[PDB]
Every structure is written in C-alpha cells, then in structure tokens.
Amino acid sequence: SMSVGFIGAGQLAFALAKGFTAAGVLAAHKIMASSPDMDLATVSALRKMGVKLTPHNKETVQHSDVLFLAVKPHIIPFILDEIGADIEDRHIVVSCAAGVTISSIEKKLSAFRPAPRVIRCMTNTPVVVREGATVYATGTHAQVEDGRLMEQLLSSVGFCTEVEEDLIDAVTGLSGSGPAYAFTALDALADGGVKMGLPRRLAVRLGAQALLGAAKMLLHSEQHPGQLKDNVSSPGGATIHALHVLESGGFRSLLINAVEASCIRTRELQSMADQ
Amino acid sequence: NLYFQSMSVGFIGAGQLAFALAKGFTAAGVLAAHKIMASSPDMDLATVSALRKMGVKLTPHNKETVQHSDVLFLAVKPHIIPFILDEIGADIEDRHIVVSCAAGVTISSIEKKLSAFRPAPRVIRCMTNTPVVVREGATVYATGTHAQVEDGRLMEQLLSSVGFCTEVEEDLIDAVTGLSGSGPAYAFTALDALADGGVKMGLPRRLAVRLGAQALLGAAKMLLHSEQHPGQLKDNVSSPGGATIHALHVLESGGFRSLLINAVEASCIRTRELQSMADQE
Amino acid sequence: MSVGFIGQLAFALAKGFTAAGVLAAHKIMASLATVSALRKMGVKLTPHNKETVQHSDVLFLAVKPHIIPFILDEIGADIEDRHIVVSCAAGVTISSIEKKLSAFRPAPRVIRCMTNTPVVVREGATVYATGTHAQVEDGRLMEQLLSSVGFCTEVEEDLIDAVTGLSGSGPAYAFTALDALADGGVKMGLPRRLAVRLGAQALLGAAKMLLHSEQHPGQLKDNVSSPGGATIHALHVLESGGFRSLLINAVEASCIRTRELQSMADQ
Amino acid sequence: NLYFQSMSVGFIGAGQLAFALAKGFTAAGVLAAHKIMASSPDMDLATVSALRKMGVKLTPHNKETVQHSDVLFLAVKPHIIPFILDEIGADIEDRHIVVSCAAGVTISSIEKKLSAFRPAPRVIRCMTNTPVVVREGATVYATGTHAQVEDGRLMEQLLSSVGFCTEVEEDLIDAVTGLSGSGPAYAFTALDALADGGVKMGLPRRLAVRLGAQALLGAAKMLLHSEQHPGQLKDNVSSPGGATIHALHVLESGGFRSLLINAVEASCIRTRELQSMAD
Ligand SMILES: O=C(O)[C@@H]1CSCN1
C-alpha cells in the first residue's frame, strides 16, 4: 500500500529503486524520484522500470509515505528548507546523505512541524543486485514501528540491522566504502592474472567469482576468517607463498587504514553538517 | 543436457577439497551421497567424520575407490600423485575419467604414468577452489590427449553445479591457481583486516565481520552482473570529496594494487616450481 | 571587440587567440622575454597599465597573485561600465577583486578563470566562474573566446582550486613525465631526440584516444596489455612504486596550495 | 609519394591491434574497408564484431588472408608467429610484403622460417601503438634483408597516415616498445589516477577525466611543437612559491621519474625475454 520517494537520482537512489523493484516488495508505480538535472540515461532507465519521475521535489513529498534523501551532504539543508513545509505527520524521512546527523535534520524540520520522524541510513550500491549491507539509526520522534518498516524495507535488498547513530561513521568506512575497495582489488587481481598469462575477461571473471565465493563461505560459516585462511593454505604451497608477499607489503594494515580514513572523513562531514 | 544421475564418483584423498566438492555436489542434487566414495591415508580427520555423516562411503584402500567410481577425482598433494598413479595404475579401466586437482601436476605427467598400464587413459586436469562447498566455486579444466568430447562436456556440467566452470588450455591453469585457486585466502585475509578496521573505529567484532563480508559479496556480484569495467564501478561509487575517495587514496599510497599482483604472481610461480621439482625427481 | 593583458600566460593567450583568428592581433594591448615575441605578432605593447584599461573591453589580469591588489588600486578608477575584468591569477578570489573594484564603481563585472599554457597551441583546459555582477552574456562571451584555444566550461568558484591541481598544474606533470620517459628510452639505447618525440606522441595519442572514447581509462589500459606481455610487466613496476598515489598527492598538493594563496588574497 | 590505394591489406590476428590499424587506415581514407581482410582463431571477440560493421572481410582461414593480400600484417601473439609462418609460408608469393608487429620477434627469425619455402621474403618489422585508432599513433619500422627500396617508403607512407612514423635500426625496436609501445598504458593509468585526485579535491568524475586528458594532450602537443627541453617547459609553468612547484615536489619525493624509467626498462626487458624464449 505504502509509497516511497527519492529526493535525488544519483547512483545510490537508482540502486535502491532498482533493488526495490527487483524485490517486488512494492510496485514501481509506488516509487517517485525527483532530480532537477536527471540524465536521460537515468530517466529512461527509471521510466522503463515504471518509476514515476518529476523535477519538483515537492511532488515527491506529496506522493510519498517514506522519503529517501539521497543527495550530496551539503545539498541537504537546502532540500529541507524547500520541502520542510510539506512534511506531514505521516512522513518518514530516511536520510542517506553521508555524515548528515539526525540532529541536523530534526533541527531543520522542527522549524515547521514539531515531531519529524527521521531515520538515518548507511547503505551501499550492491542493493542494486539485492546484496547490500545497510544499517539505520532511529531518531527522536521515529515511532517503534518506523524502525521495523525501515528494517523490512531494506532487508529485501541485502543485510540490514539497527545500530546506534554513533557507529554509522564506522559502518561507512567498512561496508559503505567497502565496495570501492573490492572493485580496486578485483581490478588489481585481474592485472595479476593478465601478468601471468590469463585473458583480461577471464581474469576479471575468475577474481570476482573467487571473492564472492569466499565472502559467501564466511557468511555461512561459524569459523574465524583466519581459520578459513588456514584451511586453504597447504604446507609449502602456492597460497601460503602468496600470503607471505601480501604480509610483507602490510596488506592488512592498508585495509585498516582505509576503513579508518573513510570513517574519519565521514566525521569531518558530520561536523560541517552540525556547524 | 547429459544424463549422469546413475554415475559414481570417487575421491583419492579425503581432505578439504574432497569434502568441499562432495558437499557442493550433494547440495546441488546432481550426486547421491552414497554414489560417492573417498579414500584417505588416515581416518582420524574431521573431514572424514563429516563425509561419513554426509552419507559418503569411506575406505582406506585407494584401489577400492577406483573400482567403485566412474569419475575419479585425485585430490592429494602434488608429490603424492605419481605414487597414487603407481598404486592404482593397473586398476584403471577404459570407463574411467581421471580428474586431477593437484596444483601444478601436468596432464602429460599423469598420462605418462598411467600409459605404462593401459594405453589411452582419459585424463582431465582442473583447478577449483573451496567455495564449491557453498556452490560458488571458480573452476577451470583442460582435457587430456585421450579425453573424449563428451568427457569435457560431462566434466563442465558436473562442476558448473557448484560454481563458475569453463575450459582452458592447460598452460593457463598455473595462472588460474594464483588467481581463483589462492583467491579465497586473499579474501579471508582481507576480511580479517577490514574487520580489525571496523573494530578500531568502534564496531562490535561480529558486526564488523558480517558487514565486510556482505560488502565484498555484494560488490563481487555487482561486477559479475555488470557489463562495466571494475574501474567504472569504483568511479560510480566515489562521490567528490567523499569518504570513499579518501580511503581509496590511502590504499594507493600503500601500493594496495601491486600487493595483489604480487600475490597472484607468487602463487603462480610457486605452482610452476612445485611441478619442476616434481618432474626433476 | 577589444582585449587587453596586464607573463608566460599573457603571451600564451594572445598567441592562441590570434592563431584562432578570433581577434585581430592589433585589437590586443599588453603591459621581458615575452616582449620581443609579442611585438613580432603585431600586438600593441604599452608600459602603462592605465593605457591597457582605456583601450580594452575584456581585461585579462595575468600577474602574480599578490600583485593583483596593487593593479586594482591603480586601474580601479579607470574601470568603466563596459569592462569585463577576467582574473587568471592563481588563488585570487572573485570576492577579493570585487572588494577592491567596488570602492570605485559599484557593479564591477568580474570573471575568474583557471587556464593553462597549452592555450599557446590551442589545446588548453579552461574553467571559469562568473562574478556577482557579471551578466549571463559575459559568461557566454568568455566561453566563446576561450573555447577558441582549447576546452572551456563554467564551474562554481569553489571548484577552481581543484581544477588548478588537475589541469592548471597538469602540463608540468606531463613535462616531468616525458623527461623521465625519455631518460628511460635513452637508458634502453634510444637517441634522446627520438625518445622525446616518441614519448610525447605516445602521451598525446593516449590522451586523444580517451577524449574520443566512451570508455573508462582502465578499459583502454586493458586493451594495451597482452597477457604475459611487456606492457603488463611495466604496469606492475609502476604499481609497486605507488605511481597512482603520487599523481593523487600532486593534484591534492596543488589544490591545497591554491587555497593557501586564496587565504593570503582574502587576508 | 607512392600510389597504393588499390592494394589489399591483410591482418593475421583480428585482435586489438588489427582493429586499431584497420580503424585508423579507413578513417584516414588511405584504404577502403572492403580491401581489408583479417583472420582470427576466435570470432567471438568484441573487436571481431567491430571489424564486421566496418566492412572488413573476416575469415577463420589464415590461408585466405594471405592469398587476398599484398601487404600482410602479423598481429598475432609473439610465441605463435612460428606456427603461423609454417602454416602460410608456402602461400607467400613474390608480391608480398610481410609486416610483423609482434613485440620482440626479430626479422631474422621471420626470414629464417620463410626462407624455407621461397627465398628473398620481403619482411618489415614495426612497433606501433593503439592511438593509430585516432590517427595519432607512434610507429617505428625496420626493413629486412630482401625488402626493396620502395617497400620501406610504402611502409612509411601507409603508417604516417595514422600517426608519427620513422625508420629505425632493428636493435632500437625493443626500447621503442617499452617507451611508445607500452606508453599509452602508462598514460591511461596516469589519467585514471589524476581523475581520482580531481575527485578527491571535489570535482565531478567526468569533469576530472576530461580536464586531466586535455591537460596531457596539450602538454604533449606543446612539447612536440616547441624546440624546447621538457625541463625548460616545466620551468616556464612553475611560478615561484606556486601550486605547481608544490605538486612537483610531492612527485619528486615519491621518485615519480624513476618509476617511469623503471617502466620503460621493464617493458623493454620483457620484450627481449619473449624473443629469447622463442629462440
Ligand atoms: O604488452 C604488450 O605486449 C603490447 C605489445 S607491445 C606493447 N603493448
């Protein structure tokens, strides 16, 4: 029955609308999206999906029950001023804009109506193939049923759980930025395959399949990742020789640096949102 | 396409690979567990206990596995193979398809051993990986001299039920070992580290493990279902000034890409070394 | 129309403009090494900045960033309403120029521009941001003029520091790279002149391929490298030295330094 | 100038380099697309479909390419050149000019194999690169033992239509491979990284790609059209205390120059290794 809105038509809003349509959890005609600059590829992609489109962010608000904000962080204060008068009591405001705090949203929206129902969301692009990783934090006036609605909605396109808002910066550095780390790794792994004689296309396919299978093994396993690493590495063998050169470059610490750098940049954005 | 419901499969070795392939095959429903025999040097393994409860038949006699099976998976260490080939060589019949999974061991080395017993052994060489156990493996195979056309097609249908499977020329399989053969251990290492980073930044350990693994799987599936270069997807998900591009920069400053190239090379080279040392003896 | 200059960037723009036929070289007045060349082109040279302002319609300011305030104080009273003041000085913000000029006349038409030296062969990269009092047609006029000597597009002013780090400093990164590539060719036995020519032609062709392709640079990279071949071996050693991260460091350092100049200009 | 529009051109290999040369030659107008024939062991390549739409005749028989062509480009992998030469050596005629593009394959090795079928094979070795597709390639060539005076001239004319082309001694070509052969890949890596830097500092990706590429194009054009040392051009653009000289310093602190020297060397050394593994 319910309707879903997207303010913004970027990569992430497209990913959610496509993953939601592929889940059949609501008919695409229940979905509206507004961008003042939407590219015709994203227009023709969403329109063929059945996703209703408009340039007027207020049209989305009046159409929608659940309202996704998927725009750049600095654009958010302008959005809230535009649509703030149109926020009804029925609306659930789900922010995806990175580092934008529930406080900064509730402050803006409280100038119009006193109890805005706000949820902060950290999701990632693989929702487009329904394998996203999502966390959400509920705001001051979000009713308990709102969090469940959020949970059921985002569970149709990947993993989803509730966290305290203070962990969302860290989730950003981990699962939010994660897919870009994977894409970088797969491009380098394939370069390695090419270096050793594989055709590029086959190298790309084999590396991506190996990553997926490994991650799936861990998800469906009780065991520590180090234990599964142990089970792959035969004595004297090729895998342990490879693991050694990874260690010599400090491979593990680079991934730690990455999550940390992304979380800290997210906090730097959280401060400008709160300033 | 092909009818192999009444086909018997054997494993020489009952290690991580025999267990992973048998679990995948019986989970795919293309093999009844009681049509699978495995032989192991010792029966005090955790792998044999799980094969027994799976319904797989467990013998200590390699010749018994050979007599029971039509397709014969050789899943032992690379330096054992010429001793297995000696023990069972006379037991090999015309009906047998011998599938070697040892890293490095060449089709011609196996054909040479077996030919001393019977002239036209049907040999296939393959490189698979442990995620066959959840049916998301990556497998390549090459066909030997006396491999029939149906033999490669039969092998590809078998291994496709537990992951991606394609045919390659044999001289690529060492490279493949370094990529998808060792690939899972690189992912496990990467996931352990990513989870340490999540923990450093405040997340509970179990949630950090869960989120990194889900991030890796979804990204891999994204690429497998996309017609786009991995760099384009990197580009697509990196907003200007954002957290992700800042993280990408510190990966680059450590030479993250070169380490993965180093790893694939080291594994492929070690795989070639193991064969050379074997062929010297 | 008429154009004036108030450098190595002043020469480069006048050279490209004339070669494009967009402006008669004599409708151009400027105010060193580049003084012998410019006069040869039939471009009017005058030592008095005030003469340049009185003759010109469009006014490029190509001086050192801490030198603009002194020029503005000097010519400010001579800025009529027909004038468009285009600042190319690195880091000098639109606000700082308008502040100076507005003590003389309330609505100065200011445009801020980040262009680079390859305008001299009409392959520049130019961005520009329109000032508080510039009408729409001032932006379009500027876009038409600088499109004649390379790529040109409008940006928000807060992207110009980033553009400085990418295409503004870019040509020096390429000159450093071609000098090193030529040292490499020389090491492997090529004559120096042949190595310089072949390296620069490789760079040019590669850049033109990317400008004319719909594909990602990584996709074009894949196409060069045959399996097991020479190119992928060379790519590996680039990766092992963190070659990509150095170029990221470069754009970042240039952009940050531009911001620090942008502060000295606003202080 | 030599007249050659009506000659037929053959590619053994319908891969990335055969496509690049065919695309460049047809866009230059020096050959008609229907006068080109290419052969490949694999017809499902994206490049093979691209050649079809151009009007290039595609066959899976290396024999037919030879019989169709006057000039014959060898754009196969290096190690398979020996099997190709045995396969079509009997079909080589006196009218044929054989042009090897394979990295590292020496004129001596080609002439040795081909001399077994008919003496005086006309062989030319060249190293070119993918930007021929936009007619800005970099090509060197060396004439073989039995190449006529005209064959080198005809070869230079053909390849100058798609970029720079000059004659070199054969012992320089391995070095040219590491420089202009692999060159474009170094530039693509550079452009990707520069765009990453632009994005980090806040530019949209597409804008950073365009600006980075345009910066490199115009820098390269400046150098080619000036008589000045790359170092003098670097000096001319680095104002004192400015943003550029700050960025140059971080480049130097990472040994940026040495990485590019390492790259040319590695590619050239690998090019030699490949020929020594053949021999
Ligand atoms: O990597 C390679 O072999 C190709 C052929 S020479 C330069 N690029």
DSSP per position, D133-170:
GGT-EEEEEEE-TT--HHHHHHHHHHHHTTEEEEE--G
CB contact at 8 A, D55 and D75: no
- The reply to whether residue A189 touches residue B260, judged by beta carbons under 8 angstroms, is yes
Instruction: Name the token pair of A275.
Output: 């300033």
Q: Is C182 marked as binding a ligand?
A: no
Helix, strand or coil, per DSSP, at residue A23: helix
Q: Report the distance separating Cα C30 and Cα C62, nearest Å.
A: 10
Cα D179 to ligand 1 centre (Å): 10
D139 and D84 part of one domain: yes
For D35, the enclosing helix (H) or strand (E) is none
CB contact at 8 A, B205 and B195: yes
Instruction: Name the token pair of C28.
Output: 């151009």
Closest ligand 1 atom to C231 CA: 1
Residues lining ligand 1, Cβ inside 6 A: C 224-226, 229-232; D 103, 177, 181-182
Q: Report the distance separating Cα B14 and Cα B48, nearest Å.
A: 6
Q: Report the distance separating Cα D189 and Cα D175, nearest Å.
A: 20
Closest listed residue to residue B80, CA positions, set C243, C116, C206, A235: A235
CB contact at 8 A, D238 and D245: yes
φ and ψ of B56, to 5 deg: -75, 145
Q: Report the distance separating Cα D159 and Cα A140, nearest Å.
A: 71
Specify the residue with its C-alpha closest to ligand 1, atom 5. D103
Q: Measured between CB atoms, which of A195, A198, A200 is closest to C233?
A: A195
Q: Measured between CB atoms, which of B196, B210, B246 is closest to A261?
A: B246
D164 and D226 part of one domain: no
Q: Tell me the residue range of the domain where B21 lies.
A: 1-176
The count of domains in chain C is: 2
Closest ligand 1 atom to D274 CA: 3
Instruction: Name the token pair of A253.
Output: 């610490």
Beta bridge partners of C58: C3, C84
CB contact at 8 A, D43 and D238: no
Closest listed residue to residue A7, CA positions, set A72, A100, A98: A72
Helix, strand or coil, per DSSP, at residue A261: helix
**C-alpha dist (Å) from residue B81 to B12, B62, B73, D239:** 10, 12, 11, 69
- The reply to whether residue A188 touches residue C236, judged by beta carbons under 8 angstroms, is no
Chain C residues whose beta carbon lies within 8 Å of the beta carbon of residue A188: 239
Helix, strand or coil, per DSSP, at residue A64: coil
Contacts of C226 (CB under 8 A, 6+ apart): C232, D77, D103
C182 and C157 part of one domain: no
Give D254→chain B minimum CA distance, Å. 10
Please give the single-letter amino acid code of residue D197.
G
CB contact at 8 A, B219 and A214: no
Beta bridge partners of B97: B71, B122
- The reply to whether residue B238 touches residue D205, judged by beta carbons under 8 angstroms, is yes
Chain B residues whose beta carbon lies within 8 Å of the beta carbon of residue C219: 229, 231-232
Q: How many CB pairs under 8 A join B and C?
A: 41
Closest ligand 1 atom to D17 CA: 5
- The reply to whether residue A232 touches residue B182, judged by beta carbons under 8 angstroms, is yes
Chain D residues whose beta carbon lies within 8 Å of the beta carbon of residue B245: 196, 199-200
Look up tokens 């899972």; give the residue.
Answer: B184
CA–chain centroid gap for D85, Å, is 21
CB contact at 8 A, A3 and A66: yes
Closest listed residue to residue C110, CA positions, set C85, C147, C83: C85
Q: Report the distance separating Cα B117 and Cα B87, nearest Å.
A: 11
Chain A residues whose beta carbon lies within 8 Å of the beta carbon of residue B239: 72, 98
CB contact at 8 A, C149 and C119: yes
Most ligand 1 atoms within 8 A of CB, residue of D73, D125, D173, D267 to mutate: D267
Task: Give the burial string for C4-29 (b: 16+ CB within 10 Å, else e).
Answer: bbbbebbbbbbbbbbbeebbebebbb
- The reply to whether residue C196 touches residue D223, judged by beta carbons under 8 angstroms, is yes
Beta bridge partners of A94: A68, A119
Q: The domain spanning residue C71 has which CATH number?
A: 3.40.50.720
Helix, strand or coil, per DSSP, at residue B62: helix
Beta bridge partners of D100: D74, D125
CB contact at 8 A, B258 and A211: no
Look up tokens 């961005």; give the residue.
Answer: C127
Domain end marker among B176, B209, B237: B176
Q: Report the distance separating Cα D272 and Cα D178, nearest Å.
A: 10
Largest interatomic CA distance in chain D? 68
What resolution (Å)?
2.3
Contacts of B214 (CB under 8 A, 6+ apart): A131, A132, A133, A158, A159, A175, A215, A219
Count of beta carbons in the 10 Å neighbourhood of residue A48: 9
Cα D182 to ligand 1 centre (Å): 6
| Among D161, D165, D244, the residue to mutate for chain C (most C Cβ within 10 A) | D244
φ and ψ of B117, to 5 deg: -100, -50
Annotated binding site of B: 12-17, 40, 42, 62, 75-78, 101-103, 170, 236, 243-244
**Residue of chain B whose Cα is closest to the Cα of D207:** B240
Contacts of A64 (CB under 8 A, 6+ apart): A3, A4, A5, A32, A91
- Number of continuous H segments (helices) and E segments (strands) in chain B: 12, 8
Going through D31-96 in order, the beta strands assigned E by DSSP cover 36-39, 57-59, 71-74
CB contact at 8 A, B13 and B76: yes
**Quick one: DSSP state of residue B185?**
H
- The reply to whether residue C236 touches residue A191, judged by beta carbons under 8 angstroms, is yes
Instruction: Name the token pair of D78.
Output: 């290096």
C159 and C76 part of one domain: yes
Count of beta carbons in the 10 Å neighbourhood of residue D61: 11
Task: Give the burial string for C61-79 (b: 16+ CB within 10 Å, else e).
Answer: bbbbbeebeebbeebbebb
- The secondary structure of chain C as a DSSP string is --EEE--HHHHHHHHHHHHTTSS-GGGEEE--HHHHHHHHTT-EE-S-HHHHHHH-SEEEE-S-GGGHHHHHHHHGGG--TT-EEEE-STT--HHHHHHHHHTT-S--EEEEEE--GGGGGT-EEEEEEE-TT--HHHHHHHHHHHHTTEEEEE--GGGHHHHIIIIITHHHHHHHHHHHHHHHHHHTT--HHHHHHHHHHHHHHHHHHHHT-SS-HHHHHHHH--TTSHHHHHHHHHHHTTHHHHHHHHHHHHHHHHHHHHHHHH-
Closest listed residue to residue B243, CA positions, set A55, A169, C232, D175: A169
Instruction: Name the token pair of C260.
Output: 């620090």
Chain C residues whose beta carbon lies within 8 Å of the beta carbon of residue B257: 239, 244
Secondary-structure percent of chain D, ordered helix, strand, coil, rounded to 5: 60, 15, 30
Q: Integer distance in angstroms from the first to the last C-alpha of chain A? A: 39
**Residue of chain D whose Cα is closest to the Cα of C156:** D203
Please give the single-letter amino acid code of residue A13.
A
Please give the single-letter amino acid code of residue B120.
A
Closest listed residue to residue A123, CA positions, set A147, A104, A98: A98
Q: The domain spanning residue B238 has which CATH number?
A: 1.10.3730.10
CB contact at 8 A, B129 and B184: yes
C159 and C183 part of one domain: no
- The reply to whether residue A212 touches residue B136, judged by beta carbons under 8 angstroms, is yes
**Residue of chain B whose Cα is closest to the Cα of A132:** B218
C209 and C222 part of one domain: yes
| Gaps in chain D after residue (C–N beyond 2.5 Å) | none
A230 and A94 part of one domain: no
Task: Give the burial string for A187-212 (b: 16+ CB within 10 Å, else e).
Answer: bbbbbbbbbbbbbbebbbbbbbbbbb
Closest listed residue to residue D24, CA positions, set D60, D68, D73, D62: D73
Task: List the determination method.
Answer: X-ray
| Gaps in chain B after residue (C–N beyond 2.5 Å) | none
Q: Report the distance separating Cα B236 and Cα D204, nearest Å.
A: 10
For B190, the enclosing helix (H) or strand (E) is helix B183-200
Q: Is C157 marked as binding a ligand?
A: yes
CA–chain centroid gap for C196, Å, is 23
Computed on alpha carbons and rounded to an integer, the radius of gyration of chain B in Å comes to 21
Helix, strand or coil, per DSSP, at residue A48: helix
Closest listed residue to residue D28, CA positions, set D37, D39, D20: D20
CB-side neighbour CA atoms (13 Å) of D179: 32
The strand order across the sheet containing A52-54 reads A52-54, A31-34, A4-7, A66-69, A92-95, A118-122, A132-138, A158-162
Number of residues that this document lists for chain B:
281
For A217, the enclosing helix (H) or strand (E) is helix A200-219
CB contact at 8 A, A60 and A54: yes
Chain C residues whose beta carbon lies within 8 Å of the beta carbon of residue A197: 227-228
B43 and B87 part of one domain: yes
Domain end marker among A138, A171, A204: A171
CB contact at 8 A, A206 and B220: no
Q: Report the distance separating Cα A52 and Cα A46, nearest Å.
A: 8
Largest interatomic CA distance in chain A? 68
Domain end marker among B176, B195, B213: B176
- The reply to whether residue A191 touches residue C227, judged by beta carbons under 8 angstroms, is no
CB contact at 8 A, D223 and D236: no
Instruction: Name the token pair of B153.
Output: 């097609």
Give A23→chain B minimum CA distance, Å. 15
Give A272→chain C minimum CA distance, Å. 16
B144 and B205 part of one domain: no
**Residue of chain C whose Cα is closest to the Cα of B248:** C245
For B5, the enclosing helix (H) or strand (E) is none
D119 and D60 part of one domain: yes
CB contact at 8 A, D107 and D142: yes
**Residue of chain A whose Cα is closest to the Cα of C232:** A195
| Among A161, A194, A209, the residue to mutate for chain B (most B Cβ within 10 A) | A209
Closest listed residue to residue C27, CA positions, set C61, C52, C7: C52
A4 and A91 part of one domain: yes
Q: Report the distance separating Cα D279 and Cα D274, nearest Å.
A: 9
**Quick one: DSSP state of residue B75?**
-
CB-side neighbour CA atoms (13 Å) of B168: 26
Beta B57-59 vs B71-74: how paired, if at all?
unpaired
For A6, the enclosing helix (H) or strand (E) is strand A4-7
C203 and C101 part of one domain: no
Question: CA-CA-CA-CA torsion for C137, C143, C149, C150, nearest 10 degrees?
Answer: -170
Cα D211 to ligand 1 centre (Å): 27
Q: Measured between CB atoms, which of B229, B235, B252 is closest to C242?
A: B252
CB contact at 8 A, B64 and B83: no
- The reply to whether residue C253 touches residue D250, judged by beta carbons under 8 angstroms, is yes
φ and ψ of D10, to 5 deg: -120, 145
**Quick one: DSSP state of residue D177?**
I
Chain D residues whose beta carbon lies within 8 Å of the beta carbon of residue B168: none
Contacts of D241 (CB under 8 A, 6+ apart): none
Question: CA-CA-CA-CA torsion for C3, C6, C9, C15, nearest 10 degrees?
Answer: 40
